[PDB]
Enzyme design. Structure first.
Site: not given
Ligand SMILES: CCCCCSc1ncn[nH]1
Ligand SMILES: CCCCCSc1ncn[nH]1
Lengths: 168, 170
Positions: B69, B75, B78-79, B83
């Protein structure tokens, strides 16, 4: 000029930067890639008349994330299903022929109200493009949902992804 | 409610379910764990007077997500920073002594306006608990920001995490 469905290998090609070319949109590779195939993609129709994607991810117990999340209680992480939706919106921008690298810009409301267990068979994503903006920065806004075996489990309103000529 | 800072090994213990006990909150293990240490956690103070967490993740180029990635453009996703904020709010609920397994419920506005390159040293998370609800389901609402080497890059309003006992449905 446009292909409307893609196989896992088309996506892996994209992940190498060989589908949309160098400096343009790429999907991530495993283990970050959350899509096995794009069943449908167009720039017309959808909820808002500005296009749609439908994509799938096959599930089985041996998917890496199940072992570490959590020990004794496997369940696919919500952030990964969320990220699939951004992955798809990015893919859409590159597929439209726009130049630049993709970056998620965020979203409005996000909801998780179900889960993907390792006993599931298939996760399906549905994305509805709301708007594309083609000003000094190019970006897409979309709503998306994630479903597992027919059942709707996540939703995200106002997903934003943008393209960057020069990498923020 | 007693210990106010945690090391990576405290967190790995939590990941095994040995910090808060069986059926209670767990952090995920590597490679999903996005925290190296919790520098500070209390249930008073913060933006809203209802508690705060400060946590860190050390960065180096060989972190797994950089290689996939993306190829030719690493990079941090963001997810994953997002998280980490849910991981932290979950941790807070279990740390308060409440029973049940953690699940992220979602959030309000999320913004990404910077990035974590592999040349970075350290990501820091700051979470401000806004509200806890102790009704038939127990849950926390919080705002959070993610910073890299002093610079603020992500923000999330209305992060929600909830706890689910053996009777609570999902
Ligand atoms: C085009 C793919 C979508 C993922 C980008 S994830 C991201 N890294 C920093 N900001 N956002
Ligand atoms: C708090 C830890 C985050 C991982 C749970 S991701 C999630 N799947 C369905 N509900 N939430």
């Amino acid at each position: 000029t446009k292909q409307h469905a893609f196989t896992r290998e088309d996506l892996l090609r994209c992940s190498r930067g060989e589908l949309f070319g160098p400096g343009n949109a790429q999907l991530p590779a495993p283990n970050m890639l959350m899509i096995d195939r794009i069943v449908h993609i167009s720039d017309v129709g959808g909820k808002y008349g500005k296009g749609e994607l439908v994509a799938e991810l096959d599930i089985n117990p041996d998917l890496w994330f199940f072992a570490c999340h959590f020990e004794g209680d496997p369940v696919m992480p919500g952030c990964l299903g969320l990220d699939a939706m951004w992955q798809l919106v990015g893919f859409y921008l590159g597929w439209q022929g726009n130049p630049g690298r993709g970056r998620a810009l965020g979203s409005g409301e996000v909801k998780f109200f179900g889960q993907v267990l390792p006993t599931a068979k298939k996760v399906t994503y549905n994305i509805h493009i709301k708007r594309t903006i083609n000003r000094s920065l190019v970006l897409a806004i979309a709503d998306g949902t994630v479903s597992v075996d027919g059942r709707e489990i996540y939703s995200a309103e106002g997903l934003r992804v943008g393209l960057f000529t020069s990498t923020f």
